Design a binder for this molecule. Structure first.
Ligand SMILES: O=S(=O)(O)c1cccc2cccc(Nc3ccccc3)c12
Ligand SMILES: O=S(=O)(O)c1cccc2cccc(Nc3ccccc3)c12
Ligand SMILES: O=S(=O)(O)c1cccc2cccc(Nc3ccccc3)c12
Ligand SMILES: O=S(=O)(O)c1cccc2cccc(Nc3ccccc3)c12
Ligand SMILES: O=S(=O)(O)c1cccc2cccc(Nc3ccccc3)c12
Ligand SMILES: O=S(=O)(O)c1cccc2cccc(Nc3ccccc3)c12
Ligand SMILES: O=S(=O)(O)c1cccc2cccc(Nc3ccccc3)c12
Ligand SMILES: O=S(=O)(O)c1cccc2cccc(Nc3ccccc3)c12
Ligand SMILES: O=S(=O)(O)c1cccc2cccc(Nc3ccccc3)c12
Ligand SMILES: O=S(=O)(O)c1cccc2cccc(Nc3ccccc3)c12
Ligand SMILES: O=S(=O)(O)c1cccc2cccc(Nc3ccccc3)c12
Ligand SMILES: O=S(=O)(O)c1cccc2cccc(Nc3ccccc3)c12
Ligand SMILES: O=S(=O)(O)c1cccc2cccc(Nc3ccccc3)c12
Ligand SMILES: O=S(=O)(O)c1cccc2cccc(Nc3ccccc3)c12
Ligand SMILES: O=S(=O)(O)c1cccc2cccc(Nc3ccccc3)c12
Ligand SMILES: O=S(=O)(O)c1cccc2cccc(Nc3ccccc3)c12
Ligand SMILES: O=S(=O)(O)c1cccc2cccc(Nc3ccccc3)c12
Ligand SMILES: O=S(=O)(O)c1cccc2cccc(Nc3ccccc3)c12
Ligand SMILES: O=S(=O)(O)c1cccc2cccc(Nc3ccccc3)c12
Ligand SMILES: O=S(=O)(O)c1cccc2cccc(Nc3ccccc3)c12
Ligand SMILES: O=S(=O)(O)c1cccc2cccc(Nc3ccccc3)c12
Ligand SMILES: O=S(=O)(O)c1cccc2cccc(Nc3ccccc3)c12
Ligand SMILES: O=S(=O)(O)c1cccc2cccc(Nc3ccccc3)c12
Ligand SMILES: O=S(=O)(O)c1cccc2cccc(Nc3ccccc3)c12
Ligand SMILES: O=S(=O)(O)c1cccc2cccc(Nc3ccccc3)c12
Ligand SMILES: O=S(=O)(O)c1cccc2cccc(Nc3ccccc3)c12
Ligand SMILES: O=S(=O)(O)c1cccc2cccc(Nc3ccccc3)c12
Ligand SMILES: O=S(=O)(O)c1cccc2cccc(Nc3ccccc3)c12
Ligand SMILES: O=S(=O)(O)c1cccc2cccc(Nc3ccccc3)c12
Lengths: 159, 163, 159, 162, 159, 159, 159
């Protein structure tokens, strides 16, 4: 059970409830707001917006990837806590079974602090892509920095 | 030590939809300014005379002229703006009514959902061998809660006001 | 202290996801479509429909009553299980601190079955009689009925 | 309608005894030090819950002839390292019907081969009834005399807790 | 950047509050009781059972490895959760920066459920020895049991 | 022109007033108690023990070195700070006018943390034999460690 | 690891409530005032004009370096005592990690005298180049010399 893991910490001028709404609860929608050139649509197909909720993110028709689904494992918007899981979608490929994210945020001034952890759950006797991992933190970190900048400059959004 | 003069302490537990950073700011840091903005008929101005809006800072809160009162003097004893903590003391001004040595405000807030949780604890300190009026206490808490409640509605209404 | 406990076991032709949506998850917004001659507005004042959510139902201007705020406690919608708190509002008389409903449905063929466990808790400052505890029941029994008629005649709603 | 009162006493103190010493005697081991200093007033004292850390509770018992009989205490916050503690006298016959509980905050600091302390004690009234100086001064003088007693033995014995 | 993670779930017949005191809280001393042949000492350098506790170990002089050092990130003693990291040691080979221990137990019947995660963080540039992984599990597992049975055979131990 | 100052930070189980006394105030007398094969005598030749005080420390006979004189420039015992300086002796070779010593200690639990800064000042138109600094620290640290162990065993010395 | 230390005692007719501000508190805006050709911009991007603040001086298009960042380990704007650290920026050659500047201004009638301790601290095994010290000591003394003029020139400013 060899699972590669990236546990990191970040810090923002953006407020923590706001950033959470943007990067966790509303992520499926916000992905399409920040990258209309990559994602055609983002929805919920199962759940009411809390634990057990299932989203469907669809790439534009010209993108190599097709779609992904994530499920909400635990959510406690009270203390900016959620653990979700990417359990279906081409990006996974054949070597990976599901990618699990666990996010913890907290206010530090008018801004935030967060502990983000990614763990890749490989299929029986497969090699987790070390490269797939660099691509993972890459795609997100950009997204997170891209959102942070919209928000900074549009303070009424999710405020 | 025949006695260590007894002091009067109120411990409050309060909650807002306002995010702890907007409130730490509106009612602690820029309070001096937000009072006059919120209640421009009672206070002409608030202005930091000493320090640079940080620890050991002291402000002068000024009432109108016709108003019984004139100026209030607050000193900043402890701050951790990151964690929304503050000790700030009231010492120079006639709001005491020539009997209280000082009033000790201790404040701690924390985020919840889209809002705040709040630790407030007021302590009234008299000058040598004087009584600590229940009266002033009734009023020290009542004017501030009203104050607080006005500034909440503002910030709920105007959602970009504090940063 | 001690409280009055109404416990029940009702049965319905409507499927349980249709009732759970109509009478638990969207109750607040459904009380106004059905009793627009009583209620002006229903709304979540805070929450993601999760567990710490709070809704607000407002009575019409003339109505002797003014408002109620309900705050979910824990949910399992998939299973149609919900415990939800009536913590404040004009409706609570001085004798009542809160009223706790415990909802759990199951399927019965093309219909449903459900047990309800409504509890009136008082304030130390007063005691609980039966006239009021009997009214709550009527209000809420009569509501469902009005809704059953509706979920039966329009099968598209929350199906 | 208003927030209930409670009475606080702030003290600032200075000792020529090293501070880790007095943190052991009047705080971490108050329950055992109280009997050694005052076997005349106390029969025993001891722990009943925990192993010294946050949440730890202790029990105090006065001889069979004393008009008081026992006292309970819970440790709210311990940061021994900087000599800060917050504990609560929450149960025993010492709480005259008006008193609900007594909260004690203590911070100590090094000053040469001795120390400086700031002690704050907060009495909390129970619904309806009111607190008064009675319980307080008596409470103030009991704690102080004990400590002086501590101070004179800790000095008279350099290696004890040193 | 990427770490080797080990997620483990087993479950043992002992009340959580009893394993907890042995396999983690006092795991310094009871590690000798367990192996008075591989283990020389069990010590708590600092921490009064306080989070941020750091222990000190040393195998018998014969053993090639000198000692092991742990800090306790957090301990929910009341809740039977603990996070601890192996931060220094001869056992901590020159290619591993730290090995993190995430353990959470809870009562199940008259037994326990064991899920624990250990993460292997490699010192900058190194791949980390996949040997130290297989090894890590076997050694702290074999010891898992010893301590189970013993505690099983004495119901008065840490009651 | 610029001198060499080595900024150190250390930790002792001993209390700061103990460290400070032993390693600073009666240091001239302890060096002989701890190292009577190295040293013959410690004394004060120009001072009362207050600021601007001078000690005279002779090395046993048949020893390379002959003696050393230090002056106590700043003394704030209350906060455990000191500024003293070696300015005379064959131990200071041809180069360096004066290596300066600055000790700042703090209480912590049953012990103490320290901050020490040695500032080696080159001799008029010279370089600093940065190999005499390597030599200076060692002996001063052993002296220390010997004193540490000595004070721990006998907890009545500098109480 | 050794460090390079500067003991410089200066003088100046110009009043210290102006130099101190210029030379320390508003140095970031004034560097950029005395040498527009060396720097195009300089600002405070963190902290709030007090101990713990961080500055960003931005060298012009035509410079090897483009920016450096300073931190105020300590401020005392009434006794004219400061202690700020150069933590980040290109100027720090692989062998230098930070420079610690301790300044103290005293009042000599209508002017000042001073003591500046500049201490360059090396990274893990690396050592500072004699070069690295005279450079820093000079463009800075030079800067000071232009301001002695600037100010004296016009008592209007900083008075
Ligand atoms: O404004 S929102 O959609 O709320 C929004 C919310 C959060 C992040 C966003 C990033 C980019 C663009 C947005 N809006 C946008 C505006 C114009 C065109 C396309 C997107 C973002
Ligand atoms: O799935 S939904 O599409 O919202 C859905 C649609 C219509 C009625 C539903 C009733 C109960 C639970 C649902 N979902 C749900 C999903 C996950 C967890 C808990 C409840 C219902
Ligand atoms: O550069 S950033 O957006 O800052 C970026 C910031 C921080 C971390 C990053 C990690 C991986 C990839 C990026 N790639 C990337 C790739 C293409 C465009 C933009 C970014 C990261
Ligand atoms: O592009 S960024 O992450 O901004 C980037 C920034 C700085 C250094 C990089 C080194 C390798 C790969 C990158 N990116 C990358 C992006 C996509 C696929 C593969 C590699 C680097
Ligand atoms: O969901 S995110 O990573 O945030 C994401 C953010 C932005 C762009 C993305 C594009 C492709 C795949 C994603 N997910 C993905 C997940 C795991 C592995 C590889 C790609 C993207
Ligand atoms: O950007 S990442 O860490 O890659 C990221 C990856 C996946 C989910 C995330 C959710 C919330 C915030 C993020 N970042 C974040 C950054 C700064 C502060 C707080 C959170 C998330
Ligand atoms: O953010 S950084 O942490 O520096 C960072 C981390 C990792 C990779 C990065 C690649 C490009 C730019 C960065 N910075 C960046 C910063 C803000 C906006 C866009 C890119 C990268
Ligand atoms: O807008 S005001 O009417 O003054 C106002 C009225 C009442 C309460 C206020 C509280 C905070 C900030 C305000 N204004 C504000 C204005 C500019 C900058 C920052 C705050 C408040
Ligand atoms: O409680 S108030 O009386 O308004 C109050 C009185 C005095 C000082 C206060 C400082 C901060 C916040 C307050 N209120 C507060 C309320 C809710 C949450 C957080 C703080 C203060
Ligand atoms: O007196 S208090 O309400 O405490 C009070 C406190 C502080 C400022 C006040 C300003 C105007 C009127 C008040 N009260 C008031 C009282 C009686 C008649 C009319 C007005 C003020
Ligand atoms: O309480 S304050 O928030 O500073 C405050 C807030 C708003 C209005 C006030 C009016 C008068 C006196 C104050 N202080 C005060 C303090 C102690 C006793 C009596 C009045 C007022
Ligand atoms: O009682 S207080 O808690 O102060 C109080 C606090 C906050 C708001 C108040 C509003 C109206 C009356 C109060 N009572 C009141 C009573 C007598 C005179 C004036 C106001 C309010
Ligand atoms: O439609 S209404 O005429 O408002 C309506 C009228 C009367 C009773 C109703 C009961 C349940 C749902 C309704 N409507 C509804 C409509 C859309 C979605 C969910 C419920 C009811
Ligand atoms: O307060 S809300 O207005 O929804 C809100 C608004 C914006 C961002 C939020 C982030 C987390 C939790 C919320 N609310 C929440 C409320 C109750 C329980 C749990 C979370 C957020
Ligand atoms: O029962 S509810 O279902 O919320 C309800 C449903 C429909 C109509 C109602 C009208 C008034 C009060 C309610 N609540 C209420 C609560 C307790 C006692 C009496 C009435 C109503
Ligand atoms: O109002 S009465 O019918 O008189 C009434 C009287 C007595 C008990 C009742 C209980 C539930 C509902 C009522 N009304 C109701 C109305 C329509 C449908 C179902 C029940 C009750
Ligand atoms: O029973 S009622 O009186 O309408 C009622 C009263 C109070 C709370 C209720 C909550 C859910 C469903 C109801 N009715 C229901 C009806 C059929 C099947 C399952 C639930 C509730
Ligand atoms: O706990 S102490 O104060 O340390 C204490 C010290 C020494 C003797 C004491 C005797 C009785 C009661 C105590 N407590 C007490 C508390 C409140 C009121 C009056 C007495 C005594
Ligand atoms: O203040 S006393 O009332 O005796 C006292 C009362 C209750 C607890 C105390 C704990 C530590 C030290 C005290 N005195 C102290 C004195 C001098 C220096 C340091 C501490 C304590
Ligand atoms: O005699 S003691 O028993 O200590 C004593 C105990 C309790 C209260 C005291 C009050 C005043 C003076 C005392 N003596 C005193 C002695 C030295 C310094 C300060 C006060 C008190
Ligand atoms: O550390 S290991 O490298 O796996 C290891 C290697 C060899 C023997 C071991 C014996 C006991 C515990 C281990 N680990 C361990 C870890 C934490 C607490 C207690 C024991 C042993
Ligand atoms: O060693 S092996 O049998 O290879 C082994 C193989 C697979 C899993 C193991 C787990 C724990 C201990 C082992 N050995 C062990 C051996 C002797 C005493 C205690 C534990 C394990
Ligand atoms: O540092 S001391 O602690 O005095 C020291 C203590 C004990 C023995 C010493 C022997 C030689 C040189 C020293 N110092 C020295 C100092 C500067 C340069 C070269 C040597 C000795
Ligand atoms: O020590 S200097 O190298 O000049 C120096 C270098 C860099 C920054 C300085 C800031 C204030 C004073 C200095 N000294 C000083 C001395 C005499 C007159 C004016 C300034 C500074
Ligand atoms: O003349 S300087 O004052 O340095 C100077 C100041 C401002 C901008 C400069 C741009 C290029 C070269 C310089 N000279 C230079 C000289 C030697 C090495 C590197 C650059 C610049
Ligand atoms: O010329 S500077 O522009 O500082 C300069 C810039 C960059 C690198 C330099 C290297 C050596 C000497 C310099 N200057 C120098 C100046 C006077 C005397 C001796 C050396 C360097
Ligand atoms: O650049 S040079 O003079 O060559 C120079 C060379 C070598 C060392 C220097 C030290 C300080 C200032 C310089 N220049 C300087 C220039 C004008 C006024 C004050 C000092 C130094
Ligand atoms: O910041 S100052 O020295 O005052 C300074 C003042 C004026 C111009 C400077 C140009 C380059 C580098 C500096 N500093 C520097 C410092 C340490 C090492 C290397 C360069 C300059
Ligand atoms: O730069 S000047 O052109 O004089 C200048 C022009 C306009 C406004 C100024 C304000 C402050 C300091 C200056 N100069 C300054 C110059 C050197 C050192 C310190 C301050 C100002």
């Amino acid at each position: 059970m060899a699972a590669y893991t990236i546990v990191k910490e970040e810090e923002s001028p953006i407020a923590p409830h706001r950033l959470f709404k943007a990067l966790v609860l509303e992520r499926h929608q916000v992905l399409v707001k920040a990258q209309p050139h990559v994602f055609k649509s983002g929805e919920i197909i199962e759940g009411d917006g809390g634990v057990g909720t299932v989203t469907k993110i669809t790439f534009v028709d010209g993108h190599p990837l097709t779609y992904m689904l994530h499920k909400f494992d635990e959510i406690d918007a009270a203390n900016f806590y959620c653990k979700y899981t990417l359990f279906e979608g081409d990006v996974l490929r054949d070597n990976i079974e599901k990618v699990v994210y666990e996010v913890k945020l907290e206010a530090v001034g008018g801004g935030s602090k967060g502990k983000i952890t990614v763990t890749y759950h490989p299929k029986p006797g497969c090699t987790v892509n070390e490269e797939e991992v660099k691509i993972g933190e890459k795609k997100a970190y950009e997204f997170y920095k891209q959102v942070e900048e919209y928000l900074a400059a549009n303070p009424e959004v999710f405020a």
